[PDB]
Structures are given as structure tokens and as C-alpha cells.
Amino acid sequence: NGPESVLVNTYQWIIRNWETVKIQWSQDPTMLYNKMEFEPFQSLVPKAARGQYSGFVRTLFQQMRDVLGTFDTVQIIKLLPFAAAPPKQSRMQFSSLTVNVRGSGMRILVRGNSPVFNYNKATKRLTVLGKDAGALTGVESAVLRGFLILGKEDKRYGPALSINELSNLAKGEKANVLIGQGDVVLVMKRKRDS
């Protein structure tokens, strides 16, 4: 059972079982993250990264539960397998998350689409490494750790910052961030936390 099909089968599995997954993501997340069905995927994620990725993704998911009206189905399904590792707490922001496929790092972009995770809004279908993975059913809460994405660049808040330059922004302060793929968005550092 090679890596390509491990990635494809993992997302097909989340999709086929989304009814119970979604439920458990709200009502018993720990049990969901510990499901054995995520181990194959986990074996592909670089060992040095598994923990930090999981701490990042679980925090983002908690942001999304806490911040009401920001539930994003596609984002949850994308990031979920990275939550399966035991988390190591850290402060780093990630723009992509790696799965190793035969010595080559495939980069899953935290925001929007990539060869490994490509969602088509017209057909309502997910594609993983060119394989069809099945059908799927104003602030972004699961993109940055301890921030919300507000919307488009607002030039009033000054020149954009990269994702590793955000630590000095004051809590509650707003700023423009180079968020990946050349996109600049307005964000806000949260006062509330998890």
C-alpha cells in the first residue's frame, strides 16, 4: 500500500465517513485525532515535523470552534490528518505542511489548493495527486495560529508582513500579511486564546 494511495485513501475515508467525523470533531476531538485510520498518513509526515504540525492544526481547529460562524468544511478535511500526531506546543506559523512521498516533500498549502489537495468549487469534488477523492457538501479562523484573517489587504494598516514577522503585533492590532501564493490579506492578532 504505497504513499500515493495512503494519501488518496485517507481523504476518501474522511469524505466517505464525514457524517461521523464532523460530529466527533465538535463533540469528541481527542477521540477523532486518535483514530487508527490516521496512522498510515502520519507515517508519511516527516518525524521532525509531526508534533509541531499537530499543535498548529489542533490550535487552529480550536480557534474555529471558539470563533462562532467560521466553520470551514474543506479546511477541516484538509488539515485533519495532521492533527493525528501527539502535539508539541510551539509558536511557529506554517504556510504549508509536508507529506513525504518517496523522498519528495509534497507541500499541502494551509490556505487554498495544491496538487495533493485540490478542491473544485464548480464540481464540488476533491482531487488528491490527480485522483478523484469524492464529493463535498466573513473571517478565517484556521489559517494562522492566534490570528483571524479579516479579508483583503487594507493599505491603511501599512506594508505587508511575512508570516514569521508577526510576533510584535499587539493583541487586537490589525496588519497586512503575505499569506502565501503572493496574496496579501488583512489579519488581526487575537486577544482571546486557547
Author numbering: 540 to 676, 685 to 741
Lines from the paper:
Viral determinants of virulence and transmissibility are still poorly understood, although lysine at position 627 of the polymerase subunit PB2 (PB2-627K) is now known to be important for avian influenza virus adaptation to mammals.
For comparison, we also present the crystal structure of the C-terminal portion of an H5N1 PB2 protein encoding PB2-627K (A/Vietnam/1203/04). The PB2 protein of the pandemic H1N1 virus shows an altered polar surface when compared to the avian H5N1 PB2-627K protein. In particular, the side chains of R591 and S590 in the structure of H1N1 PB2 occupy what would otherwise be the positively charged cleft in the H5N1 PB2.
